[PDB]
Amino acid sequence: SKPIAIFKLRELSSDSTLFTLPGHSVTLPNTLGIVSHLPTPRKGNPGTVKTMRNLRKTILLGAGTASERAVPIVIKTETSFPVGTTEEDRAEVLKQMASFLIEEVKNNQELAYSGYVQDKYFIEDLVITE
Amino acid sequence: SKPIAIFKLRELSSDSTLFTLPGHSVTLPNTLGIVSHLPTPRKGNPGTVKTMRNLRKTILLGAGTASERAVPIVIKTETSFPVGTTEEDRAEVLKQMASFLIEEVKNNQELAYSGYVQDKYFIEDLVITE
Amino acid sequence: SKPIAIFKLRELSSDSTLFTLPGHSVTLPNTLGIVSHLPTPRKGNPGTVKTMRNLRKTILLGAGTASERAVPIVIKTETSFPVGTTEEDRAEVLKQMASFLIEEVKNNQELAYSGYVQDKYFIEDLVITE
Amino acid sequence: SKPIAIFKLRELSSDSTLFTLPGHSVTLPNTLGIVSHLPTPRKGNPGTVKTMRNLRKTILLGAGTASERAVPIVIKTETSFPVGTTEEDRAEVLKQMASFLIEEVKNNQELAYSGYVQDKYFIEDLVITE
Amino acid sequence: SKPIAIFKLRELSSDSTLFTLPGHSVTLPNTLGIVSHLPTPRKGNPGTVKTMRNLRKTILLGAGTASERAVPIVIKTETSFPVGTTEEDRAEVLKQMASFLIEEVKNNQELAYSGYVQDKYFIEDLVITE
Amino acid sequence: SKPIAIFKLRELSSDSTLFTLPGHSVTLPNTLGIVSHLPTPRKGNPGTVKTMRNLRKTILLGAGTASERAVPIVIKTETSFPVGTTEEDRAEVLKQMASFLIEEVKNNQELAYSGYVQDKYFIEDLVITE
Ligand SMILES: [Ca+2]
Ligand SMILES: [Ca+2]
């Protein structure tokens, strides 16, 4: 229950920024890239904010083995919210997504690591406040 | 705190399936597509599982207005896990992702809906795994 | 007296940086933008620093009216100071400028919003320090 | 506190009027000029009043030096207010502007004369009345 | 013994930034450019960080003379550190470099300003690290 | 605080000379190359002495690992001083450079090894005499 910190690093572009997680070594990078494409209003149409978040953690593979491979694990999350959308709706889709991720962790990454796809899934609704 | 229940609508493909969320009206679709590509072993390289899941909730804009628009809110989580990684490391990246989602909801969608890229981000660690 | 905080939004370029004011909303933007063209020393001519700053506030018109128009309200300030000018004189021109703006607000936007040209003007050279 | 008096010099046109500040000298001009483009009501669109005011102060450089250059120091303010905007918001943008100018004078011309971009800014919303 | 203070003038590029030294007049620039190219991992080869820093001080020649010349003095330190090296080894090379610079200043710039290549060089080891 | 010695080796060219550091093995070279380009006076222009110093230290990488890489660490320092430059100015730029190197060593090679670039830097002025 100890708070996790994420620090700034080089600003790759006007929309792309790179951040270091606490587990980040130079030999094994552990970084979160965040890119926010601001909405450009089309003629007669409201914009749609786009946010893409690439968390990636480098893991040594077979380090004791003579053949060693430095290999990344990536969780990317892109989120397209149109302007004028209810904050409640946005919060709902985020709650559902985080809840499914957590339930998959509790599942021992059954789907992610073993390709098993259950017919019907259940995720406990998450309620968290300040 | 009602368990969010997601059913299997239909099997799109051998790797693609599409589930329906509870709020799924046929007029306003509310779907969760999940695709899992089994890793393909390569000569000298272990496979890498890829699981891509998009959650999509359809919302109206200006329902009372004569000109209304049916637009989707969309979250997407791509997860590339190489074969031979630690379940601990997978849990780490997934907990970090879900925690950042939750903290961004707790942030009143500052980053997503407004485009504020904060210099440093503090996410609560997740002990809700149980 | 409550200080007003101008946050950094995104860095458009090395010259242009957009900041958001506290009144900002994504539907009705309220932003300062600020650019500083550095002095380029010429052959025997010292450079001139040009700082151009554009501040725009987006307000709706006739909200209840079925025909509503979201329009901006802009105040731009361009400031060209040559290198080697005594600082005191730049302090003077800036004080004169802010004082005239303040006196026009005191005058209830006579000049600005009614286009009434006045024959003479009077402003207060208020020296405000820390 | 001594009020500063801006005199009328000559009326260039119905739009443009040049005034002289108290620091004026014919060898080193010190003048405000002020123009108010009135609103032209369009077909269903209310006009926007544009008041552009250019204030220039002419100072010598290196007087004792045999090579001296009489150069101006300019601060221009352009203010575009659409018809029907609440007066309060124009008061707000003008107060914010004058306050930022004042805080830059308080800051000893860091931004203006050294081109140092700051990450955040703070100004005081001082309400000065009659 | 005053702490030498170097400020960030502006962000030139995503990898390039330019700082100003204390003695930085706009007429005689005194800058420290620093560029850090993040290592690019290669197939079978770890990345190698490269950090290049040039310190440049502008000085006049024959100021009293009618024909004077504004010329730069320039130091440049390129530092290529491969990923996975020992911080001890990095400290070794950096201490050796700074010590040779100091000993060359203590040498009254024999090598740099006169071109004397001595057969054997004795540098004090640096215990000022603290 | 034990003195470090640097020995002559083969004279590569009329301007380039190679030296051995004390940590120098034949299997892992540790050498300082020094090259001094003497100033050639142009017609009506004084020369500019150029001095380039490449210190490089070879480090075994993953020696216990089956895959072993012999990899160099390079600190190069080029220094261009024009003829007629004040010795005090030369000494200042060298003091600043060595001070920044030392402060970076004290920084645990934060910039050099991890690409982190602080907004504003401070280096303690170094004063050393015979
Ligand atoms: Ca008249
Ligand atoms: Ca920045």
Coordinates of C-alpha atoms in Angstrom, one line a residue, chain C residues 17-73:
Chain C
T17 CA 4.2 27.8 -25.2
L18 CA 0.5 27.6 -24.5
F19 CA -0.6 28.0 -20.8
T20 CA -4.1 27.7 -19.4
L21 CA -5.7 30.2 -17.1
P22 CA -7.8 29.1 -14.1
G23 CA -11.0 29.9 -16.1
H24 CA -10.2 27.3 -18.7
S25 CA -12.7 24.7 -19.9
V26 CA -12.2 22.3 -22.8
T27 CA -15.6 23.3 -24.3
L28 CA -14.8 27.1 -23.8
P29 CA -10.9 27.4 -23.9
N30 CA -9.3 30.2 -21.8
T31 CA -5.6 30.3 -22.6
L32 CA -2.5 32.4 -22.6
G33 CA 0.0 31.7 -25.3
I34 CA 3.5 33.2 -25.1
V35 CA 6.3 33.5 -27.6
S36 CA 9.8 35.0 -27.2
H37 CA 11.8 35.6 -30.4
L38 CA 15.3 36.0 -29.0
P39 CA 17.7 38.7 -30.3
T40 CA 19.8 37.9 -33.3
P41 CA 22.9 40.1 -33.1
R42 CA 23.5 41.6 -36.4
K43 CA 26.8 42.9 -37.9
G44 CA 27.3 45.9 -35.5
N45 CA 23.6 46.0 -34.5
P46 CA 22.4 44.5 -31.2
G47 CA 19.4 42.3 -31.3
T48 CA 15.9 43.2 -30.2
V49 CA 13.9 40.8 -28.0
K50 CA 10.3 40.4 -29.2
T51 CA 7.8 38.8 -26.7
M52 CA 4.3 38.4 -28.2
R53 CA 1.6 37.1 -25.9
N54 CA -1.9 36.3 -27.0
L55 CA -4.6 35.7 -24.4
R56 CA -8.0 34.4 -25.5
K57 CA -11.2 33.7 -23.6
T58 CA -13.9 31.6 -25.3
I59 CA -17.5 32.6 -24.2
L60 CA -20.9 31.5 -25.5
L61 CA -23.4 33.9 -26.9
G62 CA -27.1 33.5 -26.4
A63 CA -27.0 30.2 -24.6
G64 CA -30.7 29.8 -24.2
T65 CA -31.2 31.0 -27.8
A66 CA -31.4 28.1 -30.2
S67 CA -28.8 30.0 -32.3
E68 CA -25.7 30.3 -30.0
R69 CA -22.2 31.2 -31.1
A70 CA -19.0 30.2 -29.1
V71 CA -16.7 33.2 -29.8
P72 CA -13.3 34.2 -28.4
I73 CA -12.3 37.5 -26.7

